[PDB]
Design a protein around this ligand. Sequence first.
Ligand SMILES: CCn1c(=O)[nH]c(=O)c2c1nc(Cc1nc3ccccc3[nH]1)n2Cc1ccccc1
Ligand SMILES: [Fe+3]
Length: 288
Amino acid sequence: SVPWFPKKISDLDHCANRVLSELDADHPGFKDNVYRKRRKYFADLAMNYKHGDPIPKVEFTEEEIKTWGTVFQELNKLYPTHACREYLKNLPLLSKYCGYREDNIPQLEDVSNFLKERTGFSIRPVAGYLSPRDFLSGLAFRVFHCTQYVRHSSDPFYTPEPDTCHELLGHVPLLAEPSFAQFSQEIGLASLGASEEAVQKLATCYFFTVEFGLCKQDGQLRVFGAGLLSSISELKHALSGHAKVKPFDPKITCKQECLITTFQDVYFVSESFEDAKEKMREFTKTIK
Ligand SMILES: CCn1c(=O)[nH]c(=O)c2c1nc(Cc1nc3ccccc3[nH]1)n2Cc1ccccc1
Ligand SMILES: [Fe+3]
């Protein structure tokens, strides 16, 4: 039978809280009580959020802003030579309209309003990890489930999980691009009511495009994956020449394991967002 799926944007209220502040043993904040309480604060904001609410604005601490600034400064040195053209086109729009600065962490509500105007994408704060079914279902309504907390200050350059720096620097500039927004939405649409098997394959395709994708533009390899765009070391590695790269091909890509604690073993290159979108259309017919 077909599993429940959201039919309108407010139905995400019923799955966005089905979370699967619970830090892993190796988390840099695992023994930090103050950070643990800060994380509970953010998780509660997300749990209490309902569709239609303005996303609660947060007063970030000086420490949090310094962590953001450190990451922001170093990544921005690399984007011109590493990021895809769509990313580079939209980043300055975010400095102008959403307050992307070294000494200011943008508010999710402002970013959500910006995205709504540009592509109809919006943000929903999320407490933590959701099933791939629930997470991808948001994309069907152009909703990006977004973390609001900041990584621990002890290691600004590495995070064991998504944090708001990753969301804001990695994902948002491409969600502002219509071709990419359509590509993303169609992953979500394909997932709705799909088999467990199909959802898992869509999630892996999502991982190797939206999170760790490369693309070819004017003959050059460029980065569009958000996980790369917010990781200084892997961003450099991905275009270093020491990385294994393969063409994006959903039937093959979906067989690849998604690594968490290390660099990826392989990156997949899309010809364009339009082509990646076409390839997913062909693929989803075979699994759904
Ligand atoms: C389709 C896989 N997938 C899933 O099945 N469920 C998710 O909830 C999910 C996700 N993917 C991302 C977003 C995400 N960005 C990442 C960047 C680097 C490494 C892992 C990432 N997960 N999320 C959101 C998320 C993940 C962990 C903690 C908080 C929020
Ligand atoms: Fe991500």
